[PDB]
Amino acid sequence: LDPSGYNPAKNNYHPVEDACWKPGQKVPYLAVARTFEKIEEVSARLRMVETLSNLLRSVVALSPPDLLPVLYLSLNHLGPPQQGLALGVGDGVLLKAVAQATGRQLESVRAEAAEKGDVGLVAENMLPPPPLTASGVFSKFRDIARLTGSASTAKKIDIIKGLFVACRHSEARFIARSLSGRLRLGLAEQSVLAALSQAVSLTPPGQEFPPAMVDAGKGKTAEARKTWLEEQGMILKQTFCEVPDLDRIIPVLLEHGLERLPEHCKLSPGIPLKPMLAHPTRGISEVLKREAAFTCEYKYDGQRAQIHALEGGEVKIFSRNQADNTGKYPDIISRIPKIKLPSVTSFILDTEAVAWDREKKQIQPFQVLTTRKRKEVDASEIQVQVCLYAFDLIYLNGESLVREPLSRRRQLLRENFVETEGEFVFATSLDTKDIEQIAEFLEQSVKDSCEGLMVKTLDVDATYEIAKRSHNWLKLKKDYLDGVGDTLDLVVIGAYLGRGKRAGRYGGFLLASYDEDSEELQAICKLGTGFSDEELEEHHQSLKALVLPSPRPYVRIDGAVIPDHWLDPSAVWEVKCADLSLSPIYPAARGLVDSDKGISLRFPRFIRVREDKQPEQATTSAQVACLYRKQSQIQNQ
């Protein structure tokens, strides 16, 4: 009846009576908005999952076709990841559309959104148009993403304005948040799947209206219901790990049920799969705290690239995020015959694409690999060569190897694939358990221009079932242990207002090193992680009395982002980083290493405040240039 008072977090929720729309009718967007309100209100993930599951139960019973758009709206996704749809709507475009919808000036909404750290609250504060539809709003989002070419931005603003003028109550909050990419719900992919599993299990799809069953957890005890939903949730999470595509799972799910889902949606070449991720470990003692045999392989500094070889012969390349990278690696497609034995007909490979110097026969840093083109690269115009480092086999000649331990996968990988030094090399492995040999292999990886070591079990918990544990592998880098990472002491010269969880305080900071020759502070990087919430409020207060309207004459930031609050240089912070990079924007140590480029920090994080040190006692630009030239990858050239 009334969608304004819709409450999907009601005790003894009924998918039919407690709904706010009629069967066969389109799902209103206000129902989705009010649910986002209830989800954002609470903090327990188990409460969030059941609240959204109450939505999908009503959707799967009243409006089955609206399940797919509701799922994507809750994920703030536009579709399958290999399709590559992107909104192309920045903050400025959204704020410009907001100022045009609400009738304010751009400078009024730009300062208000930066002060609150959220565009949704700004967007909400004529004749009433028809109410917004969940599938209609999702279609408008996709219409925005598909607008390309000249004068397309003005066409995106028109659609965004068209949504905002039809919003009621809380709809403008979540449309603006979705368009900006910060839904800020506290509930993401993993909770959406678990809530989808709970919805199909409780209210099964495919029932002729009115559905004969609404709450299948009625004739169960509290213990058996939790075990039943957990078992039903793992079937969906595992199938989605091999097919992360809702456009494929939902239709099969709606016509064949959850129990029969793995029989139709199965891992196959051409369809990207979720890759195995790694868990950061402190030292080798934390590694040895895992009682089983493992292998230590180099951590190559490149990009994840899973190779898909089809039966007919077509080859597709997918990224860590299941994005299509086929047109980006034309040199890899041509090298497919030179890496497989003639008996190979189809395979899913797990490799790391690393930039390779053909003259010296040496690995190039990650910056060089990022200089390759993306959009429809011609095979001849490729300038930065790449060497593949395969470390896992997933699919081979029709048979899937997800249920096979890594020891078997490593055997069939080196057996059916042939090495080619400079283009296809297995990651150097070391299958021992001595703390002395392992500590030496880790130092050898850095000497061989690698980030560190990967640790993977060989038999005990060595499957590729990412749904059981998505961080089953361990990564051990030199900057994870204390006293070994490059520790720099830098000066805080500026601060940026925080957004989201950091709204009301500072989310980032601008750091600078001391150029002893120019008697000036040179910005080196920004800092936005490493401090606890208590420290971050302590910084926001201790530096609130240091704000300067103008920058000091001895501060140089060059192409860096102008800080929101200029800060009087006095605070000295200890910062840890994994590497030092040649920056195209930061002026720190410009001219000392490269004639035009400065130096910045890779993966910088806050450690602690240095009250003993003063700005002049901070890390000098000459020392920063010394650390860059003392890096193994730079010495190795």
Added chain:
DNA sequence: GTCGGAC
């Protein structure tokens, strides 16, 4: 990519 927080 690193990281802290609430559960």
Added chain:
DNA sequence: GCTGATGCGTG
């Protein structure tokens, strides 16, 4: 046609 701004996908 060029250029600064910036979205976005890699890490």
Added chain:
DNA sequence: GTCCGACCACGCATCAGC
């Protein structure tokens, strides 16, 4: 331990404004 959302550098690809 899981899940989530704060934040980082870098560089290709894109488009409003000129």
